[model samples]
Target: CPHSDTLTIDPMITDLAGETSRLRAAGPLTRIDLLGVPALAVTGHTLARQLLTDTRLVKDINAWSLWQSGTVTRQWPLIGMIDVDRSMFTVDGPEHRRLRIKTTQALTRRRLDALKPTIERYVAELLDDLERAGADGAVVDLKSVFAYPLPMRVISALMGVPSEDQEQLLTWYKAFFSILTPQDERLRVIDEMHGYFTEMVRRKTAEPGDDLTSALIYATDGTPLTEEEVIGNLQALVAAGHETTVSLILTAVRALLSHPEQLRLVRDGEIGWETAIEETLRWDGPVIHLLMRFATEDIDLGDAVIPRGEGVVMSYRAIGRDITVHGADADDFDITRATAARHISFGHGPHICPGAALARLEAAIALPALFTRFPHLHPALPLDQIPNLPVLTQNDLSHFPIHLGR
Candidate 1:
């Protein structure tokens, strides 16, 4: 709180590199305003690891003095993300392990490996649709035609969510992550998501299927997830599962299109496609700023001490390319760089992303097949001309026009 000036984050996140650079210059932990509320940002990679793994720093909103007192209201726009109960995202200690274990169990390497053929099918069908759409020398928005659907459909099937409800879930999710959304509307989005997922849980309870939702509903080992726990985990999986991978695909495609030499390396077998995907995660991670941890007690970060009950969020996308962590050429997107995979983009410690394997598998399967199918594919617009989604949490492209082939 000693910092005199606080940087307020723009809802649209129009300038990612510029904004992250400014935060880096401000040093490791900078006081900032998130969603018009005062908080701290963990800017560099060192601080991100320190804060994320510290036991005194917890995800409970009640640990925040402001939220505990009524200064940070429950109706706040970001409540939908942080205020959920019993989900892995909001809980810590024993409960976090319990809930997250269930999620991890459902997305194991064996289970995901089984899903390979199904994922390949989705990619093939979508690519055919794109080829037809761009057949007559038309520039198609690949983000919609390809990137978005692949993850959405895959995750929906894994969760036993009907294809019919995917669009509605996305609608609620967009509002939930956007700070620009009005208080009333944000609250409605939260309620609608609960109701929607609750219905899915109910249907699964009546007629269980070979899906994640049903698996949690009738666990054989220890304690089974209650209805509340079922909805919380399912909602988190549905939201994080699709949204994060969408940005992953979009950014990977954009990075390759812009860096021609890097693409050549992958095509010629000089560098693996895995490096490209890992580099994409490092240079332009899908999550920009995640909503955060509150200090359970005064915790020292060597240079600074966050007072008990203050909030601290990590600028994950910024840390991915931090010079201190990755050296002088950190900001440059180089797929063949051997150390390109070193990053905290997916996070560290016990709270690391459970869906990371799933995301990587989808990208691994999709990227090589994509470039192989359309060898001449290229971005229609220049690097600076493409539009970025304004959502603060998701680092994404809203519009991307691409020519499949000339």
Candidate 2:
């Protein structure tokens, strides 16, 4: 076996794109110590796509040699993400198929298209709220007021969750996303999530409805999921449903505002809103690095071999801005870039995000309505001072303040 090398990352490093840029310079497959644990990061676009589809690598944390050999402890801060209960994200083959079918069935294109009007209504209400806030010469934190609520609210409505329960769910999600959250606090929040979802699942089981949560409970296709499976998938949906899209909305707005010429093109209808959304996803997609893909067998990149049983993560942040695949000007945010739509912000292959279409729909409607409502919308603080949430898996801001045009 070749000698192992590890790049240690500061758990608190919030500038993930900058860190990934440095990793890419080292090589495509660089072993790194994430949060004091050994792992490899796939830093190149081509390598990331290849490894994402490779069967020798799997998402099941139990398959990891380190975990099997008693190296990775349950006390690890990231244990909740890697050692998750059986959901579509952690399973493969027929099992993955079983868990994913209900979700896919529920999130069909027709269903999403029907939800477009509802999404528009939500957007209109949020814009109105922003206008009210700005009418008094007050700046609004659009990240919280506009970008965040829209997706969380929409997903909650689809899941049959009462509007009142959303703040609780959001609180649980924040604990999950915050890397700095104490391990004990993380577990506590997780238990709360499970308890909350278990009760919700029981309610849905007793009284089925037209919501996705109810659909998961009574899925009648191949085999019905156990109570555990139902609860696991529900948590997965509620978290994945809103978080990625929230980042996408915030990132898209930041990109547009920072680029006046691009913002002008968008406002003048010179480029489509879809183009802007796609470009934002490619340039600075919501997910920076996905955690914990265990090597079922030894895997080879041109420059290195990831030993079997070790952990690996896909650096989507770096791959999205790859100089070779995206051209020399890759780092520049250009909505008009012809190849912008080709990004795999949504992972490639079987494990890809099921909510991609819905996310796109949300942003396509939300971004246009936002710009049209507040044509003079601009940042309230300098870009550097705006803190990126100090989390490895998600690329997000704590709060993005903006001046909403009166």
RMSD of each: 2.0, 2.6
Cα lDDT of model 2 by residue, 294-398, tens digit: 888887765668888888888788788888888988888999998889898898878988888889999999988898888788888876577787776787778
Model 2 lowest lDDT segment of ten: 1-10
Q: Candidate 1's residue-wise lDDT over 200-268, tens digit each?
A: 899999999988888888887667777898888888888888889999998988889898888999989
- Local error of candidate 2 at 47, Å? 1.6
Global lDDT of each candidate: 0.85, 0.84
Best by TM-score: 1
How many residue pairs clash per model? 1, 1
Clash pairs, model 1 backbone: 12-390
Measured with C-alpha atoms, the lDDT of residue 329 in candidate 2 is 86
Q: On a 0 to 100 scale, what is the lDDT of residue 79 in model 1? A: 68
Candidate 2, superposed: residue stretches over 4 Å from native: 1-5
Off by over 4 Å in 1: 1-4
In model 2, what are the clashing residue pairs, if there are any?
Answer: 65-309
Model 1 poorest 10 in a row by lDDT: 1-10
